[PDB]
Amino acid sequence: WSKEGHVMTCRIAQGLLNDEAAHAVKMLLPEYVNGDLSALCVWPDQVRHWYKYKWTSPLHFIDTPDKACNFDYERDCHDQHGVKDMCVAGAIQNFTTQLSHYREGTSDRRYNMTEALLFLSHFMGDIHQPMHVGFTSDAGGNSIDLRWFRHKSNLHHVWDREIILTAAKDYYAKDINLLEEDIEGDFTDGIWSDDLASWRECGNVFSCVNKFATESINIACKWGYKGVEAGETLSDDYFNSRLPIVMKRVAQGGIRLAMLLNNVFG
């Protein structure tokens, strides 16, 4: 996700935290954001480009083989140089494990919990963006150049931002708070209300991130690359049809995140 998906994922996520998980996140965050996890959820996307954190480059996504439309961890979860574990699935396990050393305080200074908090949170949102588990050769839709209404863009960016900016301008006067309030609603008393417990049962972290990944490449094959030719124009038909899918994954990411943190801090 771009700024917007992450902010909503995290606001949603923070509102569902138990007492132990709220206390931890407040303490783990710098004063200048007033306890607001959302304020920093983009942080990993900034440092993505610093030589220092070059190593975080591949942890944002998974590249699956073209047209295969499924996710296999040992096949997929690696970087370009075949280095095992380097993919958003790995990172979530990694940063969740790091965070389990917080309460007991048993990692000395090998880890930074604040950074582990922002990576976990951020990457929880990325793994639900269906185009973060897309095809290798086209870079999760990045190198499928298209037009989204009256400006150049690309499929990956349609899902990272366009559908969300578009929805917020057309229906909420650009106010993202409002778009979130409705997304928050559609699973509390709304179309996804009967599904919360179902979103919350995936097993241990490893299984969960595999479930989430799988979900994403299905959505990507069914709704992402379907009905998309390069150079063409995606209109009201693509937007209106996919709006609620994007919205679902914003919610799923958030509910799923609150569950992890709740467990890591409990």
Ligand SMILES: *[C@@H]1O[C@H](CO)[C@@H](O[C@@H]2O[C@H](CO)[C@@H](O[C@@H]3O[C@H](CO[C@H]4O[C@H](CO)[C@@H](O)[C@H](O)[C@@H]4O)[C@@H](O)[C@H](O)[C@@H]3O)[C@H](O)[C@H]2NC(C)=O)[C@H](O)[C@H]1NC(C)=O
């Ligand atoms: C764990 O990692 C954390 C993230 O990497 C570390 O926290 C970071 O610590 C650095 C200290 O070097 C902070 O950067 C400083 O920011 C302050 C204040 O920033 C605020 O004010 C400016 C302008 O007034 C504004 O633009 C900012 O947005 C803030 O409102 C500056 O005075 C310094 O020059 C310096 O840049 C980061 O704030 C902080 N990041 C986060 C996410 O907390 C932390 O140090 C690590 N822990 C340990 C023990 O090493």
Ligand SMILES: *[C@@H]1O[C@H](CO)[C@@H](O[C@@H]2O[C@H](CO)[C@@H](O[C@@H]3O[C@H](CO)[C@@H](O)[C@H](O)[C@@H]3O)[C@H](O)[C@H]2NC(C)=O)[C@H](O)[C@H]1NC(C)=O
């Ligand atoms: C799990 O989280 C930790 C951060 O706590 C990550 O550790 C980092 O791993 C990367 C890549 O494996 C390291 O890059 C290395 O740079 C040094 C040169 O200083 C070199 O010895 C290595 O060949 C490699 O290029 C990075 O330095 C290291 N950082 C820390 C603080 O440990 C780890 O990558 C994470 N793994 C996953 C799958 O999320």
Ligand SMILES: [Zn+2]
């Ligand atoms: Zn993102």
Ligand SMILES: [Zn+2]
């Ligand atoms: Zn993206």
Ligand SMILES: [Zn+2]
């Ligand atoms: Zn990212």
